[PDB]
Amino acid sequence: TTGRIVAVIGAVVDVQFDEGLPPILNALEVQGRETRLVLEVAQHLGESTVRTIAMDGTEGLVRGQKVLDSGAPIRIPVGPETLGRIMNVIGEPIDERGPIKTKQFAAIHAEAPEFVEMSVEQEILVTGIKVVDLLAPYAKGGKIGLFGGAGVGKTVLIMELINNVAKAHGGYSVFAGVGERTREGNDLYHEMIESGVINLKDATSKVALVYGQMNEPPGARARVALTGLTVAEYFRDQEGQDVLLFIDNIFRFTQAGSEVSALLGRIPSAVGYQPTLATDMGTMQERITTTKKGSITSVQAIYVPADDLTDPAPATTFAHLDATTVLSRAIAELGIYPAVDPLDSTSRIMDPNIVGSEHYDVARGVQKILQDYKSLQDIIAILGMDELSEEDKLTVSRARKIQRFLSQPFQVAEVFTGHLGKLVPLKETIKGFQQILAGEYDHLPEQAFYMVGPIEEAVAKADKLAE
Amino acid sequence: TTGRIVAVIGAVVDVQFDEGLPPILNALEVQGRETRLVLEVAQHLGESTVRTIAMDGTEGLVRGQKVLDSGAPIRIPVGPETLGRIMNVIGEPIDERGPIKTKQFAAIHAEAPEFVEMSVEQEILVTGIKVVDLLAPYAKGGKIGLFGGAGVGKTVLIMELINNVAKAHGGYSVFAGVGERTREGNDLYHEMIESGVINLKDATSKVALVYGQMNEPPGARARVALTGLTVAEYFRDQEGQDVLLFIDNIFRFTQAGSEVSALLGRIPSAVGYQPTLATDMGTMQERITTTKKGSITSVQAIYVPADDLTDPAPATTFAHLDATTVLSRAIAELGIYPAVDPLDSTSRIMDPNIVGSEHYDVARGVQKILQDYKSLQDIIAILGMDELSEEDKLTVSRARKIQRFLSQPFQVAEVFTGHLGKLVPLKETIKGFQQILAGEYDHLPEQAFYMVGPIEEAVAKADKLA
Amino acid sequence: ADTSVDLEETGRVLSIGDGIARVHGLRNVQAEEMVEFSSGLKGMSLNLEPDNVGVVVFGNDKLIKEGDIVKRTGAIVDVPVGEELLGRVVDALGNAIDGKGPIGSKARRRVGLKAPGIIPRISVREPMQTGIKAVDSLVPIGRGQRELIIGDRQTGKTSIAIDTIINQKRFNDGTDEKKKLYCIYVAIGQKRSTVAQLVKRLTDADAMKYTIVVSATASDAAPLQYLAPYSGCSMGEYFRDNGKHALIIYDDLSKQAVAYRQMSLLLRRPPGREAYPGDVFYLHSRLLERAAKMNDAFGGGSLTALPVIETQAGDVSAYIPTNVISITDGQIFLETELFYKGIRPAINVGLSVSRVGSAAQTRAMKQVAGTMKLELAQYREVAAFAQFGSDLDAATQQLLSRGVRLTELLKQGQYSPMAIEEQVAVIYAGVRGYLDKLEPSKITKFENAFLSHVISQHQALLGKIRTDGKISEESDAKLKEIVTNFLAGFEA
């Protein structure tokens, strides 16, 4: 069937069909263009006219321009041939290395795995990051979310995790760049070539790359996430072998949707979002999951507008996760990195029956001394410290030490800390936090605990601080 | 040719023209009215119809009533003939003294001076008011803004400034009442006759009046400022001299526009304001300026809705000023007048290479101790001063003495305060503040510094304290 | 027989109001195509609807009437571009407004071109020295980076960008062509007299010769203020793509967003959060992505951007501000409280950042500033907490001592950007501990004298640090000898 553009407003394009009317979600190819311009059918307005969202800029389009129905939703390359390659929203290579010679293609819109396909198994995935491993440990094949306002550490954390988990990883990885920094994509790409995680010469690449950054119009940012998870699904199902899936940043999927919502004719919901925020999010998120056929360990960076976690975007995201790592500006501002909020990060596996009561109790003990200090803070800032008991102030000093022992020099962060990166074993984390709680370090100065790895370095720094 | 009214809603009137449509900004004359009713074309709606804004009451208009195209925008009288006279939005005399017989008329709309016409000479204008001269000095031919919430002192301040600058000015002045009190217009008019700046018997008048007060409909209030500034533009160029332009209150311009916008079909912007808020203000403010041809020293009183400086109206106004005097309700309640916030008032002239390093350093010094005191006030609110370090007690003390020395009795407020007004010379202002900062008066009681002129009066008062 | 007014290449105004013309015809017009009104006035086709074209006017709309003729240009909006714009002041469309005549540019460029993708780029690594100690050490900028300058009115935002422009004169008058850096100052929504003072400031400093000034002031129509930023960015891409380096300042984007909101609402696009178009983020993300570092295969040139955002009541956490922060490669946050206490530049260290880090610094600067940012963050935390009279161990007392001294060394006056080897020299004296016993109120006087000293008598040391781009064991040994001795004399 052939159509004719009857209207253009930004990324939203109305096309008219004399005969066959393409169904919602079908991909239409615009004729007369230097580069492939795809339109996705969103609605049937009536009178043989459909409303669509463009997957690239609409500058240059004219009313009356011809449009062809491909007779299906956007279909992209999937399989071993995508490894080491970079694709865009519509599965075209963007690494200037030629065609992606795959034997199969797959639609980026798919039904989510059924309830009978779910898995309940859950095992610890140690990261080497003290706060995470201790307070809200991640799980193999589980859903992990990293929340954070602008510039608090989301990306640095995901890059560190890729470094500590995906290099060792024997399966395959998928990284989806969704409405983020193009510079970050060129960064990551050369980073991975160096680590040999990506190989341009042989066929030993272990990671597939998909990108649609903030330089692209909304249609592309609204579907690139689907593109990336579509690649991941093939590895999970058509190979079973373990898959890692990293998304920076999936909020951008929701923001893209809101950029065009009013143009799509919707009445705004609260805070200027599309009335379909939750359902839009559900049909996408329910695809990012481990199943009986295979496992997917997902790590998604989640933007928090105006630093307000009650914002509908981030707020509707908590329900799709197994482990939440919440990052705070108030903590980053203090030089504490990673800026994890110890009183707002959680894990479904933080249970004595899963991690052992030693792990559980120390974590729980750390949370208690911190909530207690926090509740104390404003009081002593006014009446001073002198009114506290010797024990009440002994917790004030350990609380501050513990808060400092949660900070950590990331390997990936060397260019920022001026410190050599550090990786701490789980047992060493528990031990260290346990000892401080027990009082075995009340004589060392606070700064000894700041920006170090294992508790030994705290002792050694204290020595380096003495004289 | 003639057109006809097809619709009327408040100040908004639609008119159809079968032949020859009148361009945007043109002035139309409604027929069958006892007094001149002008309609200003705002837009071409289509189907030979135009949407316009009335400059006066629309009661009595009927669908079908005839409307005439005057062939140009509102034009008013300009020149020496406006001096001592009072006019309204559309150039009509409202002082009952007969016709204004000028040889020149001018449209109240016009493009703002071009970039190549801007001036870059920076020269101070000493007001004799301590806070202003020290911390955020005014500049000859610069733009001055006076921000203030309800009844905090904007009018008193602009009047003191007229009393301290306009009187001792060789050139002419223009005062524009925009959406304010009519009886304030009556007081001003009689005050200027008394002082001789206005003369109804000779040609010595030095001030021209333009009024469109809070009794006027939106369209009028939305345009009176253009009218006032148009009179000042003439004196600026068509005489090549120095002009003073006083306006109370330019906020009313934006508020009036907000009233008609609600009827022009626009989708509302934040806080219900017109979407064109910034550009409406821009094409108007950019005309209030000094050029290479002549200078305009402007003083605009700026109202602050609900005392919220982040309100779009005020917040958008900051960008148009060379000096900003922000009045504070909390300061006024402390008895300190003028109620100027010493830390939120700025001047593009506060530069060592302009005012000198001594003046520059004394201002930075005052603001430094005021800010340090401010940072303490939080801890003082609960426990008080008695809990401060013997050192913080000291910054507190000097700070509080400085806050009061910034205060000063006005000549124009004598009629109700009962205190002789004061005018302190800039050299005397720097010195006084230097001495307090250096500690030379740590032994003088606070109250000695409140509501006086020069430093010597503080010591004297500290003596009458026996 | 007269076919000059067909409805494919021409149209007629259906209605006109508030810079929006609704046009009948123009059947063959392209989305985002420039069109022209009978009046000589230009406009842009944004809304392509079945019965009309929605046109945005680039000038005073009072000149347009119902029925006027509108003509296609066949060209997507673009502007003049090249070196002929250096030393000139132009409007949003590229027209001269400085009264020095026509710009004889020999090339043009689309204002909406998409930013370079992954392949054409390469990691940011070349220093973009502002010449401001606090910036160059704590939040370093590299060529092709984007770094936001944000803060309430009058906190010092414009000043950082001006000094930064003036600073390049070292390299622009130099012989090393690779070090050159052309500047672009985009003025949006400002007052014309303010822009004139500005260009007079740059002329006096002799920086106007390497700068392009793009001005869409307060009385310029909304669409003109909306375009301005994209126009100057294209002028910047000319350098970026022709093996050179350019620096762009958008002062400011708060006002550009207000104009976008105006134009968008008048086009009847339903308002979003805070009355802004639901796509304000994309307005700015799109623009700033255009600042980039190109790889050698692509000429190796670059475009660096310093956007400006004005906060309300020091609220960096609001919507507009977090949007833009979420785009840039860092931000410089300034607060009025610090500005008044004497901390100028008024930078808040914990809240500012650089996403490029030491990779944008010379080895020398990294050798003295490497751990200083985190340390100064911890210093401010403990300083607030110690006010609680609590007993302080030697460790915290030393941190306080060190923090208060460094705070003084990062103070800096205006209009005198420092050479990198000179910043390295003064940073060194503090970070190495030599000033821990000097009264804090003396640190500014010390620095002024120490610096004139090394510049007067130690040009070789300064020159070696600059040439090697590092502090050798030898250079290190000589600095120690200089500071200890000079200090002793100073405290005599």
Ligand SMILES: Nc1ncnc2c1ncn2[C@@H]1O[C@H](COP(=O)(O)OP(=O)(O)OP(=O)(O)O)[C@@H](O)[C@H]1O
């Ligand atoms: N390092 C500095 N030392 C002293 N004064 C400074 C310094 N930097 C800026 N200033 C002064 O602070 C004042 C405000 O500076 P500036 O105009 O750059 O701030 P802004 O954030 O751009 O304000 P605006 O709202 O006017 O745009 C000016 O008088 C300027 O000279």
Ligand SMILES: Nc1ncnc2c1ncn2[C@@H]1O[C@H](COP(=O)(O)OP(=O)(O)O)[C@@H](O)[C@H]1O
């Ligand atoms: N773990 C860390 N250690 C040191 N600095 C960090 C760390 N995480 C973030 N930062 C600093 O904060 C900046 C912003 O972090 P980033 O991960 O890019 O934020 P976002 O959450 O916005 O993606 C980094 O470029 C760096 O300067």
Ligand SMILES: Nc1ncnc2c1ncn2[C@@H]1O[C@H](COP(=O)(O)OP(=O)(O)O)[C@@H](O)[C@H]1O
């Ligand atoms: N300089 C001043 N000295 C004494 N009282 C003042 C001064 N300025 C204002 N006030 C007090 O505040 C009142 C309101 O001042 P006014 O200028 O009329 O308010 P507004 O800011 O609304 O224009 C005055 O009547 C007087 O009581």
Ligand SMILES: *N(C(=O)NC1CCCCC1)C1CCCCC1
């Ligand atoms: N860099 C990073 O993950 N890449 C390198 C780090 C050193 C070891 C090899 C991989 C990060 C990318 C995001 C910003 C911070 C640095």
Ligand SMILES: [Mg+2]
């Ligand atoms: Mg990020």
Ligand SMILES: [Mg+2]
């Ligand atoms: Mg008043």
Ligand SMILES: [Mg+2]
């Ligand atoms: Mg500025």
